[PDB]
Amino acid sequence: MMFDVHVVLDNQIGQLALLGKTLGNKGIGLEGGGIFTVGDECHAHFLVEQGKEAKIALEQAGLLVLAIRTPLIRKLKQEKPGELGEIARVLAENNINILVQYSDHANQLILITDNDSMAASVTLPWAIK
Amino acid sequence: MMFDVHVVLDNQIGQLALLGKTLGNKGIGLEGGGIFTVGDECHAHFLVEQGKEAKIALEQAGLLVLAIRTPLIRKLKQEKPGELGEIARVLAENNINILVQYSDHANQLILITDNDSMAASVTLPWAIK
């Protein structure tokens, strides 16, 4: 039901504005994520419900969508130092590499790994209510 | 009072686990942010209160801290499609480039720009209560 939208923006003014207007004009709200600049490019990951519709609109605006994915959605059960490192440890102990991690507006944990099939069973203790 | 901690992790298992354990062992909680993989490196931005203490602990663990910064903290006043694109538009119209953007666990807007001095006055309408 929820999709991570991975867009590679140019390191230029107005790029986040174009992304947000293009999705806002379609009624697609951003449920979490952000943008990180790395050298000459800006990597955006935003969580949306209308993933396929967001991909079409962004590409029609000329933005490069690398992938839309359905992430694992989990929840840390309490806010405590070391909680994120603990779920990352159990994933690492199962030889699972974490490619994307962030939190949504419900404070739910959003994850993309190199083994989402195994990561789902490994992270079952953190399943949402 | 709040600091963004920019760490460049290796694209390897156990890196987020080392970051989270190192800060959790010091009692430093993660108040927001995430990690994005870009090629062979993983860029982490996490919001913490004990920024200087987090920098020391991460460097003693062998992790590369690119910078600690005090971000602008703003708040979208309602959750509505296009709201993020609107604040990004006003920033772009003032020739301000957005380098980092995400939301914290209070759903506050975290921003780092190439003109935080001007960005503070430009984004005054989005000031927190």
Coordinates of C-alpha atoms in Angstrom, one line a residue:
Chain A
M1 CA 0.0 0.0 0.0
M2 CA 2.9 2.4 0.6
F3 CA 5.7 3.2 -1.8
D4 CA 9.2 4.7 -1.5
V5 CA 9.9 6.9 -4.5
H6 CA 13.6 7.3 -5.2
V7 CA 14.4 10.4 -7.3
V8 CA 17.8 11.7 -8.3
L9 CA 17.5 15.5 -8.4
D10 CA 20.1 17.9 -9.8
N11 CA 22.1 19.9 -7.3
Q12 CA 20.3 23.1 -8.3
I13 CA 17.7 25.5 -6.9
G14 CA 14.0 24.6 -7.5
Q15 CA 14.4 20.9 -7.7
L16 CA 12.6 20.0 -4.5
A17 CA 10.0 22.6 -5.4
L18 CA 9.4 20.9 -8.7
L19 CA 9.1 17.5 -7.0
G20 CA 6.7 18.8 -4.4
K21 CA 4.5 20.8 -6.8
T22 CA 4.3 17.9 -9.3
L23 CA 3.0 15.5 -6.6
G24 CA 0.9 18.1 -4.8
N25 CA -0.8 18.9 -8.1
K26 CA -1.8 15.3 -8.3
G27 CA -3.0 15.2 -4.7
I28 CA -0.2 12.9 -3.7
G29 CA 1.0 13.7 -0.2
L30 CA 4.5 13.0 1.2
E31 CA 4.2 10.7 4.2
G32 CA 7.9 10.8 5.1
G33 CA 11.5 10.8 3.8
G34 CA 13.8 13.6 2.7
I35 CA 16.6 14.6 0.4
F36 CA 20.4 14.2 0.9
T37 CA 22.9 16.0 -1.3
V38 CA 25.9 13.8 -2.5
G39 CA 28.3 15.7 -4.7
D40 CA 26.6 17.0 -7.9
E41 CA 23.3 15.1 -7.3
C42 CA 20.5 15.1 -4.7
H43 CA 18.9 11.8 -3.7
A44 CA 15.3 12.0 -2.6
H45 CA 13.3 9.2 -0.9
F46 CA 9.7 10.0 -0.2
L47 CA 7.0 7.7 1.0
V48 CA 3.7 8.0 -0.9
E49 CA 0.5 5.9 -1.3
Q50 CA 0.0 6.5 -5.0
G51 CA 3.4 5.1 -6.1
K52 CA 2.8 4.4 -9.7
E53 CA 0.9 7.7 -10.2
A54 CA 3.8 9.5 -8.6
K55 CA 6.3 7.9 -10.9
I56 CA 4.4 8.9 -14.0
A57 CA 3.9 12.5 -12.8
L58 CA 7.6 12.9 -11.9
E59 CA 8.8 11.5 -15.2
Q60 CA 6.4 13.8 -17.1
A61 CA 8.0 16.7 -15.2
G62 CA 11.4 15.6 -16.4
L63 CA 12.7 14.2 -13.1
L64 CA 14.6 10.9 -13.0
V65 CA 12.9 8.2 -10.9
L66 CA 15.4 5.4 -10.1
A67 CA 12.8 3.1 -8.5
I68 CA 9.6 2.8 -6.7
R69 CA 9.6 0.1 -4.0
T70 CA 7.3 -1.2 -1.3
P71 CA 9.5 -0.9 1.9
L72 CA 9.3 -2.9 5.0
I73 CA 7.4 -0.8 7.5
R74 CA 8.2 -1.6 11.2
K75 CA 8.0 0.3 14.4
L76 CA 10.5 0.8 17.3
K77 CA 8.3 0.0 20.3
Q78 CA 9.9 2.7 22.5
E79 CA 12.1 5.8 22.0
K80 CA 15.4 4.9 23.7
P81 CA 19.1 5.4 22.7
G82 CA 20.4 2.3 20.9
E83 CA 17.0 1.1 19.6
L84 CA 17.8 1.8 15.9
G85 CA 21.2 0.2 16.3
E86 CA 19.7 -2.9 17.8
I87 CA 17.4 -3.6 14.9
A88 CA 20.3 -2.8 12.5
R89 CA 22.5 -5.3 14.5
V90 CA 20.0 -8.2 14.1
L91 CA 19.8 -7.4 10.4
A92 CA 23.6 -7.3 10.1
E93 CA 24.0 -10.6 12.0
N94 CA 21.7 -12.1 9.3
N95 CA 24.0 -10.7 6.5
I96 CA 21.4 -8.2 5.4
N97 CA 22.7 -4.9 4.1
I98 CA 20.5 -1.8 4.7
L99 CA 20.2 0.4 1.6
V100 CA 17.6 3.0 2.8
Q101 CA 16.3 3.8 6.2
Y102 CA 14.1 6.6 7.5
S103 CA 11.0 7.3 9.6
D104 CA 7.6 8.3 8.4
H105 CA 5.2 10.9 9.9
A106 CA 3.6 8.1 12.1
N107 CA 7.2 7.5 13.5
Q108 CA 7.2 4.1 11.7
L109 CA 10.5 2.7 10.6
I110 CA 10.9 2.5 6.8
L111 CA 13.5 0.1 5.5
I112 CA 14.9 -1.1 2.1
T113 CA 17.5 -3.9 2.2
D114 CA 19.4 -6.2 -0.1
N115 CA 17.2 -9.1 1.1
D116 CA 13.7 -7.8 1.9
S117 CA 12.4 -11.4 1.8
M118 CA 14.7 -12.4 4.7
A119 CA 14.5 -9.0 6.3
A120 CA 10.7 -9.3 6.8
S121 CA 11.1 -12.5 8.9
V122 CA 14.2 -11.1 10.7
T123 CA 12.3 -7.9 11.7
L124 CA 9.0 -9.6 12.6
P125 CA 9.5 -8.7 16.3
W126 CA 9.3 -5.0 15.2
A127 CA 6.0 -5.6 13.3
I128 CA 3.4 -2.8 13.6
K129 CA 0.3 -3.4 15.8
Chain B
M1 CA 20.3 23.0 20.8
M2 CA 19.8 20.4 18.0
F3 CA 22.5 19.1 15.7
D4 CA 22.5 17.3 12.4
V5 CA 25.3 14.7 12.3
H6 CA 26.5 13.9 8.8
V7 CA 28.3 10.5 8.6
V8 CA 29.5 8.7 5.5
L9 CA 29.2 5.0 6.2
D10 CA 30.7 2.2 4.0
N11 CA 28.2 0.2 1.9
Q12 CA 28.6 -2.8 4.2
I13 CA 26.7 -4.8 6.7
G14 CA 26.9 -3.6 10.3
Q15 CA 27.5 0.1 9.7
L16 CA 24.2 1.5 10.9
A17 CA 24.5 -1.0 13.8
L18 CA 27.9 0.5 14.8
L19 CA 26.5 4.1 14.5
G20 CA 23.5 3.3 16.6
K21 CA 25.3 1.3 19.2
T22 CA 28.1 4.0 19.5
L23 CA 25.5 6.7 20.2
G24 CA 23.2 4.5 22.3
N25 CA 26.1 3.6 24.5
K26 CA 26.6 7.3 25.2
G27 CA 22.9 7.9 25.9
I28 CA 22.5 9.9 22.7
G29 CA 19.1 9.3 21.1
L30 CA 18.3 9.7 17.4
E31 CA 15.6 12.4 17.0
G32 CA 15.2 12.0 13.3
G33 CA 16.9 11.5 9.9
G34 CA 18.0 8.4 8.1
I35 CA 20.5 6.8 5.7
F36 CA 20.6 6.8 1.9
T37 CA 22.9 4.6 -0.1
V38 CA 24.7 6.3 -3.1
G39 CA 27.0 4.0 -4.9
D40 CA 29.7 2.6 -2.7
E41 CA 28.9 4.9 0.3
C42 CA 26.0 5.4 2.7
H43 CA 25.2 9.0 3.8
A44 CA 23.6 9.2 7.2
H45 CA 22.0 12.4 8.6
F46 CA 20.7 12.0 12.2
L47 CA 19.4 14.7 14.5
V48 CA 20.8 14.7 18.0
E49 CA 21.0 17.0 21.0
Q50 CA 24.6 16.1 22.1
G51 CA 26.2 17.0 18.8
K52 CA 29.8 17.5 19.9
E53 CA 29.7 14.4 22.1
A54 CA 28.2 12.4 19.1
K55 CA 31.0 13.5 16.8
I56 CA 33.7 12.4 19.3
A57 CA 32.1 9.0 19.9
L58 CA 31.6 8.3 16.2
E59 CA 35.2 9.2 15.3
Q60 CA 36.5 7.0 18.2
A61 CA 34.5 4.2 16.6
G62 CA 36.3 4.8 13.3
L63 CA 33.4 6.4 11.5
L64 CA 33.9 9.4 9.2
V65 CA 31.9 12.5 10.4
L66 CA 31.7 15.1 7.6
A67 CA 30.0 17.8 9.6
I68 CA 27.8 18.6 12.6
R69 CA 25.5 21.5 12.0
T70 CA 22.6 23.3 13.7
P71 CA 19.8 23.0 11.1
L72 CA 16.9 25.3 10.7
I73 CA 13.9 23.7 12.4
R74 CA 10.6 24.7 10.9
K75 CA 7.1 23.2 10.8
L76 CA 4.6 22.8 8.1
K77 CA 1.4 24.0 9.7
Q78 CA -0.9 21.3 8.1
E79 CA -0.4 18.1 6.2
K80 CA -1.6 18.8 2.7
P81 CA -0.2 17.8 -0.7
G82 CA 2.2 20.4 -2.1
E83 CA 3.1 21.9 1.3
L84 CA 6.8 20.9 1.2
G85 CA 7.0 22.0 -2.4
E86 CA 5.6 25.4 -1.4
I87 CA 8.3 26.1 1.2
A88 CA 10.9 24.8 -1.3
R89 CA 9.5 27.2 -3.9
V90 CA 9.9 30.2 -1.7
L91 CA 13.5 29.1 -0.9
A92 CA 14.3 28.6 -4.6
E93 CA 12.8 32.0 -5.5
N94 CA 15.3 33.6 -3.1
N95 CA 18.2 31.7 -4.8
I96 CA 18.7 29.3 -1.8
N97 CA 19.8 25.8 -2.6
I98 CA 18.5 23.0 -0.2
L99 CA 21.3 20.6 0.7
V100 CA 19.6 18.4 3.3
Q101 CA 15.9 18.1 4.2
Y102 CA 14.0 15.6 6.4
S103 CA 11.5 15.5 9.3
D104 CA 12.1 14.7 12.9
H105 CA 10.1 12.6 15.3
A106 CA 8.0 15.7 16.2
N107 CA 7.1 16.1 12.5
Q108 CA 9.3 19.2 12.5
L109 CA 11.0 20.3 9.2
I110 CA 14.8 20.0 9.3
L111 CA 16.7 22.0 6.7
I112 CA 20.3 22.7 5.7
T113 CA 20.8 25.2 2.9
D114 CA 23.6 27.1 1.1
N115 CA 22.4 30.3 2.8
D116 CA 21.0 29.5 6.3
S117 CA 21.3 33.1 7.2
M118 CA 18.9 34.1 4.5
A119 CA 16.9 30.9 4.8
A120 CA 16.0 31.7 8.4
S121 CA 14.3 35.0 7.4
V122 CA 12.8 33.5 4.3
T123 CA 11.2 30.6 6.3
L124 CA 10.1 32.8 9.2
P125 CA 6.4 32.1 8.3
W126 CA 7.1 28.4 9.0
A127 CA 8.6 29.1 12.5
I128 CA 7.7 26.7 15.3
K129 CA 5.1 27.8 17.9

